[PDB]
Symmetry: C2
Subunit: 43 residues, 2 copies
């Protein structure tokens, strides 16, 4: 159903599905999602 949500669950990451209204908001928030995940798995 939701590729991002499923992927995070499969790899054992808990998350909160924050809603968006604006396309720019989605792209920026999605960018934030990517950035945060990279930091989480950083070594």
């Amino acid at each position: 159903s939701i590729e991002m949500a499923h992927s995070l669950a499969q790899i054992g990451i808990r998350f909160v599905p924050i809603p968006v209204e604006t396309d720019e908001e989605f792209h920026t928030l999605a960018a934030s999602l990517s950035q945060k995940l990279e930091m989480m798995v950083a070594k």
Copy 2:
């Protein structure tokens, strides 16, 4: 799989699954999720 994610999708809301590290962070972020949704559907 993810009750929050599925519910939002079913009702036509796009969202970004932001990950958490801390239980307090999850509860606060979840609270933010609830607050934002209420504003979105407010009349």
